[PDB]
């Protein structure tokens, strides 16, 4: 249909096996069984794209590859270009957060197509403090007003691209693909997602991964 | 010495085992260790107070029992009442983080001395955002602004005293020790800490704390 995903995934962290299958596989047939999802183009070193190609043909999708590059928001750059000319939204993913849930992902999509970008967030636990260059609290931040930021992260193709223009003219630095639309002065939404759905790196973040899996 | 602590520990998860000690004595120990703390303030339900009891004769410390509030900021208030006249700073700690440093400590109350109020904390690892009532996204805070709190928070005792005043006159809101002196205007240094100074509260955080302990 209208949803073109971006799945980032350039042994590797996310292919590590969370209840022997690699982790990118998780959120890939995620995505891979919603309606809305046209085509997954997935970035990948060419050596890992076997763990993707196998399942091609069951899949409910066209499948795509796209060529890594140095930073994180150039592998973006090169999944952008090889979505469907029609796509309606780019939803960007890592995929070493594998237990995004079928739900989260369709509200951060309803987000996206109402305000043109939106990503999943939860707020954040700990107690945060702005700190200035002397080491000394500016302010405590209000509890209600901090979220920390997952993916999806879903932006409308236009918006994007239009966005990677003002980046590369100013030689503009980034975090996340939601700050480029921020430059933009194009709102960017916060869908409220669960605290499950994090990024696994060390082996206590596997090891909870598999306790969520059950 | 010049330093008293106020241990905060009121099965409760301080008291679930680690390698087969409760999660309370290792942060315990590591201060009665330390030339500069002259006593404990130990703030638990007089059920649990045989756990600390046990080792009064062996440390090097004055122990001392002080009643639990309501809240935390009610718990503290009481420790806060059983301290040496001549206490030159409060060390606030929190039980549940065992893993806390020697060195970090140190830190702390050094820069505790110097400030007038410090606190323990790490960079924010997560991407955070500041989002308004509206769910959008205000602006991406910046990378080095953001810290993670810990304990111990250490604090002059008459700032402290005089920031408990200000609190009850004007029935001010509190999230941890530090944001009390905040609201005198006197200055707060954050001290780097350690990633491994974690709270432990889920079965994760257990098996976490115990492979830090390796
Ligand atoms: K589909
Ligand atoms: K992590
Ligand atoms: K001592
Ligand atoms: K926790």
């Known amino acids: 249909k209208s949803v073109s995903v971006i799945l980032l995934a350039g042994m590797p962290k996310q292919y590590i096996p969370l209840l022997g299958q690699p982790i990118a596989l ?11 999802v046209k085509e997954i183009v997935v970035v990948c070193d060419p050596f890992f794209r076997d763990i993707f190609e196998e399942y091609e043909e069951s899949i409910d999708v066209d499948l795509s590859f796209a060529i890594p590059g140095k930073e994180r928001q150039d ?14 939204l780019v939803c960007i993913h ?3 957060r594998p237990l995004v849930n079928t739900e989260d992902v369709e509200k951060v999509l309803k987000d996206g197509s109402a305000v043109g970008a939106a990503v999943l967030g939860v707020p954040a636990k700990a107690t945060i403090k702005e700190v200035n260059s002397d080491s000394l609290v500016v302010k405590t931040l209000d509890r209600k007003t901090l979220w920390e930021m997952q ?11 239009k966005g990677f223009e003002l980046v590369k003219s100013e030689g503009l630095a980034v975090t996340d693909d939601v700050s ?17 759905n994090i990024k696994v790196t060390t082996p206590d973040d596997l090891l909870l991964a598999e306790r969520i899996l059950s």
Do not use: C, W
Request: proline fraction near 7%.
């Open 75 to 88: 592998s973006v750059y090169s999944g952008l270009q090889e979505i469907d000319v029609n796509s309606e």
């Open 94 to 96: 890592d995929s070493a």
């Open 151 to 161: 993916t999806p992260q879903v932006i409308k193709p236009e918006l994007l691209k």
């Open 180 to 196: 480029i639309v921020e430059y933009l002065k194009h709102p960017v939404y916060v869908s409220q997602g669960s605290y499950t």
């Open 26 to 36: 998780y959120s890939f047939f995620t995505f891979s069984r919603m309606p809305e």
